[model samples]
Target: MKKTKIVCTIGPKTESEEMLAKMLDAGMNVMRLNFSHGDYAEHGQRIQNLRNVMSKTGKTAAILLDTKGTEIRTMKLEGGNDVSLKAGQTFTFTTDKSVIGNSEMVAVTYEGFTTDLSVGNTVLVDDGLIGMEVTAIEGNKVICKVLNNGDLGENKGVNLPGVSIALPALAEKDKQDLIFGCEQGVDFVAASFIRKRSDVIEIREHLKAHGGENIHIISKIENQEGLNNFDEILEASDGIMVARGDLGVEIPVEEVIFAQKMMIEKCIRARKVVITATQMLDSMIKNPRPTRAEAGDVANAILDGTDAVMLSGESAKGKYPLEAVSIMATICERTDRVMNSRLEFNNDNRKLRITEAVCRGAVETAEKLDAPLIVVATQGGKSARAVRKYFPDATILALTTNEKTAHQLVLSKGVVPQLVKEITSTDDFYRLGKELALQSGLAHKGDVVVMVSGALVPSGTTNTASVHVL
Candidate 1:
């Protein structure tokens, strides 16, 4: 069984060549550069540093650039008083830059914010921990009341309910970063605040225009709007991200955990990649070690079946970024080896009206197969996973031409990924299948191997089934 993949963020703490070497040695398959905090020039330097280390280390680590979308945020406050907002107190929230503050009342640093909203609306503050209901509107400043009691401080996040923020999934800053990121040949582009399928399309369109359409698109579900339209976003994007920091702010924290499990399982079933992120080793950002609660939090995500668990501040600027990633890998390795072998095979966990019959047929075929290896040829890794769900005793070999799909299968239990070239004809398919079986030692010269692939069409979706021998 292969271990679940681990993605560690590279920030101020782990951006250097020395730390990057350690992180790669510690088993980080993905290196994420968060564009929210640093400038593009600084990030470009960091990307170069990573390239240098990749040359030295000889490892294929995926680089992800995370965008900061139109979620309105205030600049650092003057005096930095970290004030507390009491219940029943009245105040005002505005995107206007004229209302400069000396740490008494909060004000936004960004100027232009009046376009996407109206007068009768509410604002959520402190990472959505507290609520502020709008009472009156005067220019860009809206008088608000403290509907919920919570401490409010500098640069606390604000959320608008029932209002669709017209902020592009890609901001001006994000656009510049993506251009540079594409130039550097990064593995994936993670869009923050992904609210609709069009958001994915917009990013893809930008990539197409730039002649870099090959870059993978990872959709970060940070808002409740993204969660509500999750399925459409999943199908539209190349990958899915459970960005827990913003997700926890937009929705209930408990619900975030539930959604994490549901999303990971859904992606796994569909043969898509899933990334679970944020506050992975939050304590380690300051402390040298992660808290026991944090450790259990990561372990639970692994048990819940995440393709990859990620880090935020823990790796971005923590004292023990490598340790944080290593700890997650260790926990995932331990959990997968012990738990995955006996879980109920990938039987139908859904209540859909159509999939039950299809699942049953796949399960029965897997049960009756008498080969040295349970071979399944798939384009998207789905058909191979179908056999895996039945808990078959044979090794599941997944052959694919999609590199992202192949990389994603690294996290699936009992699946080994092999990148095979495409075959153009029936004779080519049979010969290549046997050649793969013999070379990989999944089967001997005369041993049996089950071959599975999509239909004969070039743009076929994986649905074909066949039994064969080496």
Candidate 2:
């Protein structure tokens, strides 16, 4: 299996069962449902469709419900057409829907657009496709001077770079979305535009109130405010998604590289799942093959130690969804081979925690003995995740009885999740591990293999590392 995980969004192009199966075969471990576009019924149907396909194909994939956080977008223009602006021309953004946009004025969906802004602020629309500077603030309108000329489409996104938007992270719409996602049994919920620790805490409280506390929360760092409060946000979240789309728009493009690298390193130290997202394979949205630069971009992300890379429109609404996934898998496989050769040994004793120590011991033992495989049996997939952090060369087969844990493990790098029957005793657990290790086809009789587990210990034990020879 490819080490770096792949997350694919679901949309019009790949909603069918056949298409989903093709994506699964192409190595899609996580499915994302963007709540910004579809309604409840549509999302629910897609969720059901995905589960049905998983049952038939015996492929376990986690479903992520991506919430639309406190975001701002432009309203529909008149005649359902696009508007063009010229450089140095003035344009008006109004909260009043009655102000139909032609060439000079447009409506902002957020009513507080003018109230939260002042002169000398930059405004980016359509992911920085159009740029403007706030020059004047009218009663309910903000007048801006066009920095560059470009066409603006209906319902396009708006971003105020370096400006702290006066909006709560958990808005009314997001609360509703969270509740709906819980009801639909989504395995993960990605809260967008998270600024501080309290944002994740509020979402966690809502998850508890809705009986979805077991569902993992992925905090999306999309703005500069989140960067300011990075540590606290990481403490409150189970995972992190470096949402480079808005992050790059909200900050200078040069700063984005540092932000991504820092965030991934932090996540690795904390042992939390980190996903690098947005436009990893944008060119593949139209073309069957990705540009050489895009290929390097993906390889660099893997070398940066990200747990997964996500595809937005490339897999959701693109023409070559299957090819996009296949290409990513290929890139990860080749990059991993090169990374393993020049890898720096991180044997820092001070950096090793209790769980990390056990995992590191297992990996080192396997490497020293030239073991073919490392089998990890986990109650909650913790052991497997710890092993994954080390980036060992041997295949890590993760066996879990919990279906949710199995599904979620699919997103961890270098780990293959396998759903197995419940173990009744310690003997049964060890026997099962040995059988799986030999059956993996990577291991054979008389070959040494490392096995790690927390199951053999008494009820409250956390770390237990074991090695065996087959």
Candidate 3:
């Protein structure tokens, strides 16, 4: 099994049962539903289809809802036709609702477009494919000089770099979507374009009110404001997605890697899972093969210590969705087996809890003894997550009876969730660890395996670590 997790967005291209089953075989551990595009009925269908596939295969993966938070897009053009934009052409972006987009002038959805843009600011439409420099701002109009040549589509995205956009994190539509997601029992909600700690807290409040408190709140740091307050955002967020697509548009292109490194490091320090996402296999959207650069990008993210990597359009709308996921799985497995970047971070023993310290010892024992498996007997999945912080090479099997815990544990790096029938007695609890280890195929009859539990020695013990030969 690949140590790093994979999150694949579900869209029209890969929504069917056949496609989803192939994707699972190819190593998709998380199904991410993009709320930006589909309706609730379609979303509900996708969820049902995935569950059906999982039940048939007896394979499990977490479902995640990606909220469209505070987005700005260009309004539809004349007859909804694409407009050709060329370099050196002076273009106009108008906020006037009456104006229909044309080659000469186009309309943007955000009413604050004029107020947000100042003289000399850059406006990037459609992922910076059509770039414009604001030369003048008139009433309800932002005049610009086009810097690139591209076809501008209706409802295309618009990015105003360093504008300190006034859009709220959760608008009316996002709240409705959140309720829908909560009702659907998604394991995670990746709130898009998260700008601050308060933004994550706001989403969390909604999740709590809807009795979805256990759902992981994964904040998508897509803009400069998010990077500015990343430290606090990390505190409030259950996880973080280094959403590099809009982040690349929001900041200097070169700084994206710097941001990724810093965010991954910060998440590691905080023990919050971080996902490296966007364009990992862009070429595979149309082509069968992954570019060498893209392969290196995936490898490097794994080596850099990201807990997971995500696919957006590459899996959602790509012709080669299976190939994209399969290639990513291969890359992850190869990278994990080779030089898994064990940076050997300096010891900080001052603040270690007894449970944490025991888990660390279990990890270290596994590492030193070259054990292939470490089974964590846990309740609510907390102890297993604590073990993950040590970053051991062995595949950490989170043994839990709680079905919800099993679903949530899949997102954590290298975790293979094992849901057992139940622990009838203390002997069955610890005995089941080695039994499951042998069943996992990662361990052998004579191989040494590490077993750690939280109060499992008793019914609710603090911690227990055992090294037993299977």
Candidate 4:
């Protein structure tokens, strides 16, 4: 089985129950709902469809609720018309209702547009399809010199690379969507455009208040500010996503690659789930096959130790959603086979706690004994996650009594989470783990399998490590 997990976004193209089932069978471990585009009612329908298919197929797929946090965008254009700007053209953005926009003027959704911008700051419109630089600011308006020629439409996204816009991380829309997501019981909530540690804490507090404390928080590092305060953000977040789409625009392209590696390594060390997201299969949105560079990009993320890789438009609105997922699954499988053969063990270097140490020992013992599998009995999936950080060659099967944890672990790298009955003793733990391994056809009667768990099952502890011939 492939170790790295795939997260696909649900949209008009892939929101149907039929497509959801196909994607789940094609190895999509998690489904992401982009709150930036869809309304609450539409998203709720998608959630219901996802659950309906999940129940029918019996696949443990997780749901990720991604918030639209403090997004800067262009206001509506006249009659929904678009403006085609030429290079070297001058334009003005104002908050005044009387100063209507034509080809020469536009309105920004952010009221603090002038206050947040300065002379010589670069501005990107519509995901960097159009570029401009601020030339002057007068009262509530910003005068900009167009650096690139492109057509700008109503509600197009605006990006200010390297500019720190004064805005709250959790906007009112995000709070409302978060409450909805909590009520819907999403496995994870991704907070977009996170700039500080407090942003994650604020989201967590809201989740707690809304009775969704068990919902994991994924902090998206999308700009230089978030990168600068990455340590604190990672510490505060339950997971981390290297959201390279905006990060690439905010920093140098080469720096985005560096940041991805840095964040993946940090998350591994912290035992937090890390995802490398945005545009991994961008070209696949239109084409049946991904570009060679895109394939290599996915492979590199797997080699960098990302827990999951995400698809945005490729699966959400792409022409060949199933093909994209299949291609990614194939790439991950080939990469893991080749990569694991030459992968070296470095778990000895890290300072492990008792639980982590036991998990690590089980992995090492499995490898040393030529064991084909490692079975773990976990309640909260902590032991499985810790073992996954080592990237062991053996198949790691996690038996959990909690269904939510089982689905959540679907996003973790190299871990197969199976819901099993609660085992109360060492004998039950060993017997059930062995039985499931064999039943799943992952092990044989003569093969050696390593088992790790607490003395008693569901103890919320992992201190015991043993090897048994199945």
Candidate 5:
């Protein structure tokens, strides 16, 4: 497995037993079922298929459910024709029957848009790659100007830049899907189009109300709106994922590289796991090997302190799903080896007095014991981040009862976060530690490893630390 971690989407190419097996062999740590393309029934079956595979393999791989957030797409045009709008040309957008398939007015799916939007607002479609300025409003439609020539196809997307799209994070359909996923015991939940930290809280509350426990939340950074309110989202969500596919549509594709790095660094500072997803192995969809550029992308993300890398079409519907994942794993591993050594080990330990203190202790403990591994049983990733500050050579393995805790650790430097079933008892902690240690190949029968956990071993406990030899 790549130390950076791998999340593969489960779609046509990777939905079956054979495909899943190969993917697992290729080192896929997490499986994401995109809820946008399919229904609950289909996704449930895929989840069950994965369960069967895990049962056979005895590997505790994780499952992530990605909700299809607010669906904002353009209405269909005749021939699904592309329209070129000259700069400064005035266009009237309407949901009226008379405007059907006409270039005069662009049709939007959102209801009451005329009331929701105001004049002078810019509606960026396909991520601001194309822009339309709202000049006036009429009922369900808003009249606008074509700022530039943007090749727009029917049902693409409409972005309301700087205007809060007052849509609920969880649509009715998303609620049903969330309940279904929770019932199925999905490990992580990526709330699509998450624009704020409150969105994460809302989803969590929704899950609890439905009695789904321990599901981690990943606030997908898909748009500028999501990025604008990212800090709170990071604080509230379990992890952050730079969903670069649609993100490229939100921001320039070239700009996404830097955006990806910045997001990952924020997660690092907060000690939350971040995923640099989309197109990590795009070329592998057809070719046997990834382009050097793609390889460099994965390496750069790893070196930039991203804890996880993801493959979308490359594994979901691509021809070389398993091979693609395998290559990603190898690249991350090599990148980790190269970058881990260059990290600053003697950095100031007093930055955040308490966190740094914990890390300094973990580093001292690892060194004193000559430990091959360091275990951090944490929820917020504070323990893991503390250790990272010390730059210990020992592999840092994070264990958490919260799925979010685990996934968030994925973005932390040099730490492998595992989502274990909550420790209802102390014995479970020992068992979980041993199971994960043996499974991750971080420790073997004779290897001495140092384990750290909260001082208080009671239920719902958060902080404290102790060391155990495993």
Candidate 6:
């Protein structure tokens, strides 16, 4: 069984019921819908299709609604054409609509563009495909020198690296989308381009206001501002996504590697789900098989302790959606065989709480007793999460009575969530866990298994651990 989870984005390529079934069969744990390009009606259909396939197949898959957070873009050109920029070429961006758009000049959609930008700032246009340095600021117009040779298209994205853009974290459209997502009962909302701790709080407030308090909020750290204040953001967010596409553009590419390691380690230590995403299988979008480097990238992220791995264009609009999911699962399964869950547990358990401390003890006991399997009962999936940080070599089978928690647990690594009944009493967890392990063929008689649970199954009250032979 693959411990690491796979998150597949659904788009034109995989929106149909047939395609959805195939990807789910290929080992997709979560289906992500990109709100940046689709309308509500289209997303509604996709959600319906996903639900149908999930029920028909009797599988567990989560819906992740991705929000198009406050990302700035360039306005259209004359007749909506493109402008070519090259090295040593002088270009101008102005808020003056009176000036005609041309190769030498263009207009931006942001009213505070001139106010936010400063001299020597690097402007990444069209999602970092075109780069330019601000040379001078003159009233409503800012002259820039082109850094790379690329074409700027109409209504393309713009990013200012190393500079913060003053804007609301969630636009009105984003709020509308959140409301729609809540109505659809989405499991997760991944906010793009988060800048600070307040952004995470604002997103949570919106979800709570719309009757979506149970939905998970994942903050994407894609800029320097977000990276600078990551500890606070991590504390505020339910999880973090290393959105490397924009992150690589916002900072040096080499530095993005370090940022990935730092952010992932922090999330692990904090027990928050971390997803390493964007361009992991970029080439596999068109090609049936991934490149060696892309394969290495996926393997390394699993080895780096990411809870899940995400596919954007590869499964969303790619030529080989099924193959992409299969390849990702293949890499994950093989990698986990070679390495355990890859978490580094702190030797000192004195700083941990009672629940976390007992969970840690369960992991070490399983390892010492040569136990290959551990069963954990969670009302809200916290105790299993506590055991997850130890990187134990045993398989952590999580039994939950909560439906939403079962699906939400899909984001955590090394956890296999099963919704079971007969959890009213704490001893029921032990009895059912042993029965399921034996009934499901996960273990046989005379096999050692470790089980952990709280007294009342209340949230954050896990203080029990026991070992038994099935």
Q: What TM-score fits each model?
A: 0.79, 0.89, 0.88, 0.90, 0.84, 0.93
TM-score of 4: 0.90
- Ranked candidates (lDDT, high to low): 6, 4, 3, 2, 5, 1
**Superposed Cα deviation of residue 296, candidate 2 (Å):** 1.4
Show where candidate 6 strays beyond 4 Å.
Answer: 86-90, 96-100, 147-151, 341-344, 347-352
lDDT of 1 by residue, 1-470 (tens): 33567777788778888888888788777778888788777888878887788678655466788887767775455566666677678777666565655323567644444555566577787677778777676777767677766766677677875677666677777788788777877778889889999999999988777765877788999888888889999989877888777777777667888888888877766556678887678887777677888888888887777767887878887787777777776777777665433234343445321232343354455456656565556665566555554444456677777765565455444566677777565556667877777877767866666656555544323445566766
Best by lDDT: 6
| Tens digit of per-residue lDDT, candidate 5, span 426-459 | 4566667767887888887766666666555442
Worst 10 residues of 1 by lDDT: 351-360
Best by TM-score: 6
Compute the lDDT of residue 246 as modeled in candidate 6: 77
lDDT of 2 by residue, 1-470 (tens): 57889999999898888888898899888999998899889888888888999999887889999998888888878898888889899998999976668789899888889887889999988988999999999799899999998998888889876776777778787899999988988889999999889889989999999999888899999988898789999989989999876788777789898999999988876667999998699998889999998999888989998989999999988999999999998998888776551123443435345566677778888888888688888767777877777778887888888887887887888788888988776667678988888776778888888887765464222366676777
Q: What are the lDDT figures for the candidates, one per model?
A: 0.70, 0.84, 0.85, 0.85, 0.75, 0.86
Better of 2 and 4 by TM-score: 4
Candidate 6 residues 381-405, lDDT tens each? 8878888887778888889888888
Q: Can you write out model 3's per-residue Cα lDDT over 286-313, one digit (the tens) per residue?
A: 8999999999988999888888999889
Compute the lDDT of residue 81 as modeled in candidate 2. Answer: 89
* Clashing residue pairs in candidate 3 (N, C-alpha, C atoms within 3 angstroms): 445-470, 455-461
Residue-wise C-alpha lDDT for candidate 4, range 1-470, written one tens digit per residue? 78889999989989989888989888898999999898888899999998998788776789999998887878777777888999999988887745546789888778888888899998888878888899999999889999988998877778886777777878888999999988999999999999889889889999999999888899999888899899999989989989877788767777888999999988987778999998799998889999999999889998888889999999988899999999999998888876552233335334346666777778788888998888988788788877787778888899988887887888888888899868778888898898898997888989999998877434555789888988
**Global Cα lDDT for candidate 3:** 0.85
Pairs in clash, predicted candidate 4: none
Off by over 4 Å in 4: 76-91, 118-120, 129-138, 144-154, 341-352, 456-461
